[PDB]
Amino acid sequence: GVFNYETETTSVIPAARLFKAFILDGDNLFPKVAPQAISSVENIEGNGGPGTIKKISFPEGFPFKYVKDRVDEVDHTNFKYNYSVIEGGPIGDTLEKISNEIKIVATPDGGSILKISNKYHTKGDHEVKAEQVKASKEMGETLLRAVESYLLAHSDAYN
Q: Taking the domains of the chain in order of start, what are their residue ranges?
A: 1-159
Q: How far is CA 95 from CA 43, 70, 119, in A?
A: 23, 16, 11
**Do residues 39 and 58 make contact, with C-beta atoms less than 8 angstroms apart?**
yes
54 marked ligand binding residue:
yes
Among 158, 142, 154, which Cα is nearest to 38's? 142
- Would you call 106 helix, strand, or coil by DSSP? strand
**DSSP secondary structure, 18-41, as one string:** HIIIIIITHHHHHHHH-TTT--EE
For 132, the enclosing helix (H) or strand (E) is helix 130-153
Question: Alpha carbon 125 to chain centroid distance?
Answer: 27
- Would you call 127 helix, strand, or coil by DSSP? coil
What is the domain class of 1-159 according to CATH?
alpha beta
5 marked ligand binding residue:
no
The 10 Å CB-count burial string (b at 16+, else e) for 133-155 is: eeebeebbeebbbbbbebbeeee
What single letter denotes the amino acid at residue 28?
A: N
Q: Distance (Å, rounded) from C-alpha 136 to C-alpha 23?
A: 16
Q: Distance (Å, rounded) from C-alpha 17 to C-alpha 20?
A: 5
Beta-bridged to residue 73, according to DSSP, are: 82
Question: Resolution in A for the shown PDB structure?
Answer: 1.8
66 marked ligand binding residue:
no
Q: Distance (Å, rounded) from C-alpha 94 to C-alpha 144?
A: 29
Among 70, 65, 67, 34, which Cα is nearest to 52's? 70
Structure method: X-ray
119 marked ligand binding residue:
no
